[PDB]
Amino acid sequence: MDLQLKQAKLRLLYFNIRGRAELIRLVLNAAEKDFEDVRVSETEWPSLKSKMPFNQLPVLEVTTPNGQKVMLTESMAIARLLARTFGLYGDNAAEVYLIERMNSLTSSLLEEIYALGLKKEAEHLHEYMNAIEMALKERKSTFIAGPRVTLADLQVIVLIDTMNKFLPNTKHECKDKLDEIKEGVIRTKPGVARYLRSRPATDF
Amino acid sequence: MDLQLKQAKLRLLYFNIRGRAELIRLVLNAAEKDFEDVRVSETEWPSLKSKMPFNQLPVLEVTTPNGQKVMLTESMAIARLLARTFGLYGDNAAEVYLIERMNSLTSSLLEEIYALGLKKEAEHLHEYMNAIEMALKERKSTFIAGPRVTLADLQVIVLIDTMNKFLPNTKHECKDKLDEIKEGVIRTKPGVARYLRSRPATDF
């Protein structure tokens, strides 16, 4: 039942984009936990989908220290499990509420931005951006949920990179407040700083 | 920072439907924690939205035992906070992964069902239903995450009621496995059993 994730061998299977696995890559790099970052092309996906017991990516393939292979699914469930394992998910339920309130807003905004890339909404987008900006201005701590980085600050990085690609010229005050969080993650999580500098430059 | 939710006065503001607040109502009734279940019409929403500091429902208005009024937002963040407070969120990160994997599947399926009511997909629906049915058949416990009810078993109830309204004649084997979970929640959580019997019969 306990996968012993600190020691376990970890392989992340996803496409060669940031997308919905970037948050997992950021948690593992923040924790300085090594993993195989396996980037799958859509040319390779049909054959991989046929031999493996899953139908969507990302999957985290865990090999426990005792040799047991377990395939984990559901991107945010994986990210939260890894964050809890490596001390990136707060210390009590009140802090976790702050994490999860912000992640609800930023996850929803991410999915709205993703859906508008090729469909053809600044109002629905503005609503999320105002809520995020408001929470960031009201906080009484350096990071979203307290004095130290948690999963919510890591997902802010995902959100910034998505707004830069999908909404480059959008000029909302929330962008500056998000960038402040990112600056603090880079300062305090040298594994993230190095990863962002070295990761593949991708469009999405 | 700690709202003292066991003792705090709680008012839930949402529309007079099950919708996205039913999970919160189920947690509180499972815990036998009293709350004001305030059901707002769309006739009343414009005026309420103008005087209060929020722009969407549900909101949980908490009055702590020391008299402090705090408005909580984000339906799933509220539900998880309440589940943690009342012992409905497992005991370790491995159990929580089981909760959150299942809630990812059932939340996604719920949102897909909601979006298809008036838009005009059995494939995308079938994918979620097969994954849910598969996890339910593979489990080595009475409930989704272990021997006792958690938030994931409560959201199964939300999913059943939604499939009954939106997909009455759909005949998938996952429906029976979901109904088994619901039967066990009713048996083991007398507060849920009573609530389901007494709650307003609504369309959505």
Author numbering:
A (entry chain A), B (entry chain A): 1 to 120, 129 to 212
Please share text taken word for word from the publication where this structure appeared.
Sigma class glutathione transferases (Sigma GSTs) are key regulators of Th1 inflammatory responses, making them promising targets for development of therapies and vaccines. This study presents the first report on the crystallographic structures of recombinant 24-kDa sigma class GST from T. solium (rTs24GST), which were determined at resolutions of 1.30 and 1.75 Å. The structure of rTs24GST shows a typical GST folding with the thioredoxin domain in the small N-terminal α/β domain (residues 1–90), and the larger C-terminal comprising the α-helix domain (residues 91–212). Finally, a 24.3-kDa GST (Ts24GST) of medium abundance, belonging to the sigma class is principally expressed in the scolex and exhibits low activity against 1-chloro-2,4-dinitrobenzene (CDNB) compared to Ts25GST and Ts26GST. rTs24GST is an enzyme with low affinity for GSH.
Two crystallographic structures of rTs24GST without GSH (apo form) were determined at resolutions of 1.30 and 1.75 Å and analyzed. The second structure at 1.30 Å resolution was determinated using the rTs24GST 1.75 Å resolution coordinates as the initial model for MR. Moreover, this structure lacks the loop connecting alpha helices 4 and 5. The second region has the highest B-factor values in the overall structure and is located between residues Leu116 and His132 forming the loop connecting helices α4 and α5. In this region, the electron density is insufficient to build any model. The crystallographic structure corresponds to the apo form of a sigma class GST. These structures were determined in a C 2 2 21 space group (number 20), and in both cases, the asymmetric unit has a monomer with Wilson B-factor values below 21 Å2. However, the diffracted crystals obtained under GSH co-crystallization and soaking conditions did not show the GSH molecule bound to the protein. An analysis of the available space at the G-site in these crystallographic arrangements revealed minimal space for GSH to reach the site due to crystallographic contacts, which reduce or even prevent the success of crystal-soaking experiments with GSH.
